[PDB]
Amino acid sequence: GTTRHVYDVCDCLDTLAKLPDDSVQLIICDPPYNIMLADWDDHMDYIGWAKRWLAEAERVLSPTGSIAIFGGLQYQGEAGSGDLISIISHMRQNSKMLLANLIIWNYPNGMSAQRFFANRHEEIAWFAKTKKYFFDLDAVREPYDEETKAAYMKDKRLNPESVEKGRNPTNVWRMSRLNGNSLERVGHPTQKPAAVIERLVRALSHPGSTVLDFFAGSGVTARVAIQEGRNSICTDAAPVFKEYYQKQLTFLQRSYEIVEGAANFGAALQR
Numbered sequence: 001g002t003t004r005h006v007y008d009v010c011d012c013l014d015t016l017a018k019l020p021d022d023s024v025q026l027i028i029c030d031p032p033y034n035i036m037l038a039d040w041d042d043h044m045d046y047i048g049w050a051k052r053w054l055a056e057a058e059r060v061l062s063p064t065g066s067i068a069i070f071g072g073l074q075y076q077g078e079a080g081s082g083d084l085i086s087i088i089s090h091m092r093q094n095s096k097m098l099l100a101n102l103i104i105w106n107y108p109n110g111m112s113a114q115r116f117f118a119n120r121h122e123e124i125a126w127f128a129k130t131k132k133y134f135f136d137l138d139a140v141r142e143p144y145d146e147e148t149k150a151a152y153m154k155d156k157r158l159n160p161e162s163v164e165k166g167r168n169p170t171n172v173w174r175m176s177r178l179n180g181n182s183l184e185r186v187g188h189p190t191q192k193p194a195a196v197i198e199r200l201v202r203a204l205s206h207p208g209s210t211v212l213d214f215f216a217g218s219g220v221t222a223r224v225a226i227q228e229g230r231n232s233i234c235t236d237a238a239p240v241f242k243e244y245y246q247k248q249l250t251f252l253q254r255s256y257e258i259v260e261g262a263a264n265f266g267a268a269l270q271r
């Protein structure tokens, strides 16, 4: 009943290259949306660079696996950059994966704007490797209060089972981002709130399966994986990632084993 979690500082392609085909159940992907100066030696645009890990991501996913890709739809056209649409368009043309849902993360607060509608959303593209993708809706249903539940149980037109299990969360999630006073905050500039990752982990992966994140950033995926009983592999190219990861652990003050080093990826792949 003990889960395994491996972490290390690596480039995404180097991590993927060490993972065998169909060995991962879920991938959390919140990638940078611009290439680096040196990348111009081999590419002419963002997708040219991104196509490599997107292909590798699909390769390591199991037949029942899925990948959630975070991104926006505000790309302006700057060379070397792109957004979630650049990725989706590429996938429609070159991948057999299915777009099972385009989730809208609608957050409450943000900056104001005088010349346009203030931005209050970012997206999550959920891609499934095949039609046999795993999905656990009941694990993420939102229960009605005892009052609403009662009013529905009296309505013979409605199914009692559905009422008791709760409502489908829908593909529009109203969840707030982390603020400067959040207890989760480890220092990463774009740290994602555990709440959003949790819903993905619960709905798109089963207990004891492997969750992979090669742009781990703050290491939030490992914390969620540990909490939900999943195994995990988290890597990020930034040396500071190790610090964030260790910090995530302190939040966990349960049976799990932490292992450093890409050479040990296997520990987290074992079912």
Ligand SMILES: Nc1ncnc2c1ncn2[C@@H]1O[C@H](CSCC[C@H](N)C(=O)O)[C@@H](O)[C@H]1O
Pocket (backbone or CB within 6 Å): 010, 011, 012, 013, 030, 031, 032, 033, 070, 071, 190, 214, 215, 216, 217, 218, 235, 236, 237, 238
């Ligand atoms: N080649 C690479 N391999 C692995 N990780 C990389 C990488 N290039 C960047 N990263 C890491 O990926 C993470 C991206 S955070 C991006 C958040 C959000 N998508 C946004 O655009 O604001 C960072 O932690 C960064 O260190």
Ligand SMILES: [Cl-]
Pocket (backbone or CB within 6 Å): 100, 101, 102, 103, 171
């Ligand atoms: Cl959708």
Ligand SMILES: [Cl-]
Pocket (backbone or CB within 6 Å): 188, 190, 191, 192, 216, 217, 218, 219, 220
């Ligand atoms: Cl993060």
